[PDB]
Amino acid sequence: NIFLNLNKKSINNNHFVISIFFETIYQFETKDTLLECFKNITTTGHFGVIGAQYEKIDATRWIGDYEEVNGFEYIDKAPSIYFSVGDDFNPEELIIPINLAYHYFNIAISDFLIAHPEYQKKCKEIQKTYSQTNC
Amino acid sequence: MKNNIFLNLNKKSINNNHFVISIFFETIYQFETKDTLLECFKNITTTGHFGVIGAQYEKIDATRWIGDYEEVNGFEYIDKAPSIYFSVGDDFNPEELIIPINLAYHYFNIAISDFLIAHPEYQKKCKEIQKTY
Ligand SMILES: [Br-]
Ligand SMILES: [Br-]
Ligand SMILES: [Br-]
Ligand SMILES: [Br-]
Ligand SMILES: [Br-]
Ligand SMILES: [Br-]
Ligand SMILES: [Br-]
Ligand SMILES: [Br-]
Ligand SMILES: [Br-]
Ligand SMILES: [Br-]
Ligand SMILES: [Br-]
Ligand SMILES: [Br-]
Numbered sequence: 001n002i003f004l005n006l007n008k009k010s011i012n013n014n015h016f017v018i019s020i021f022f023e024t025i026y027q028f029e030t031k032d033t034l035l036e037c038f039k040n041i042t043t044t045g046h047f048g049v050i051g052a053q054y055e056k057i058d059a060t061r062w063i064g065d066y067e068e069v070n071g072f073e074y075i076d077k078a079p080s081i082y083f084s085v086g087d088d089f090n091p092e093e094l095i096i097p098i099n100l101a102y103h104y105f106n107i108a109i110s111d112f113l114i115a116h117p118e119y120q121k122k123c124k125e126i127q128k129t130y131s132q133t134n135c
Numbered sequence: 136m137k138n139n140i141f142l143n144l145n146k147k148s149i150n151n152n153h154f155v156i157s158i159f160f161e162t163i164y165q166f167e168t169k170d171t172l173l174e175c176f177k178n179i180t181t182t183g184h185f186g187v188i189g190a191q192y193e194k195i196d197a198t199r200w201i202g203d204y205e206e207v208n209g210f211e212y213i214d215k216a217p218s219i220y221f222s223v224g225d226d227f228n229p230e231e232l233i234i235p236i237n238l239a240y241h242y243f244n245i246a247i248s249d250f251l252i253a254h255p256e257y258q259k260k261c262k263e264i265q266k267t268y
Contacts, residue, residue, distance in 0.1 A: 007154040014139040070136035086225035
């Protein structure tokens with residue numbers, strides 16, 4: 001597993017959905033797709049493949065179908081984001097604050113560029129966007 | 136959510152770069168009942184397999200086809216020692232790990248300790264299972 005620092009932090013935070021999200025996209029999708037996954041959090045706020053997705057939560061719209069998800073309580077407190085992995089019918093779900101999501105994404109893209117130095121320039125550009133966007 | 140109980144397991148699995156083991160236990164503890172987790176602990180030394188949505192293990196039968204394990208981290212253990220397969224996520228695209236059964240017992244011994252420490256009502260059942268490891 002190349003996600004050494006991501007896994008350590010996410011597992012220690014009981015956010016195993018994040019661990020699964022990155023590993024399964026990395027192993028199955030192309031590296032170009034993974035780069036888009038890293039980027040979309042700053043732009044559209046959503047990304048989805050078979051068995052893995054995230055979506056920033058629009059708190060001006062209905063949140064009733066998040067009530068049973070781990071992390072539901074974050075929505076009322078701060079801008080939050082929904083992650084899921086696995087089957088569409090029985091997904092493994094997690095909600096976390098967007099700030100924490102950016103923390104994870106910055107760690108994950110670091111793991112990736114460290115393991116795949118050919119992607120140094122592109123990953124640093126995306127990290128720059130994280131720093132611009134996220135206080 | 137349910138707070139993480141796998142304090143000692145997580146230290147060891149992370150140290151060993153066996154993240155799937157911690158994901159496996161965190162998944163079962165979060166999504167399933169404590170009685171189900173107990174059966175997870177028990178089955179490794181009885182039937183040799185256990186599965187829920189998002190987490191499973193199966194002892195590897197090295198007398199049967201192992202071609203589908205070829206790309207899994209830990210595949211090389213199969214020819215060296217009795218081994219066991221773990222996966223987390225969904226079978227469309229699961230996150231997979233193979234380790235020797237002796238190491239799996241080592242992890243389960245730590246995990247079941249975390250469990251009984253957090254949930255002392257299960258003291259006796261856990262101690263009995265631990266003896267088998
Ligand atoms: Br940590
Ligand atoms: Br999680
Ligand atoms: Br690729
Ligand atoms: Br998308
Ligand atoms: Br970095
Ligand atoms: Br640690
Ligand atoms: Br792993
Ligand atoms: Br329970
Ligand atoms: Br073959
Ligand atoms: Br291997
Ligand atoms: Br082998
Ligand atoms: Br103990």
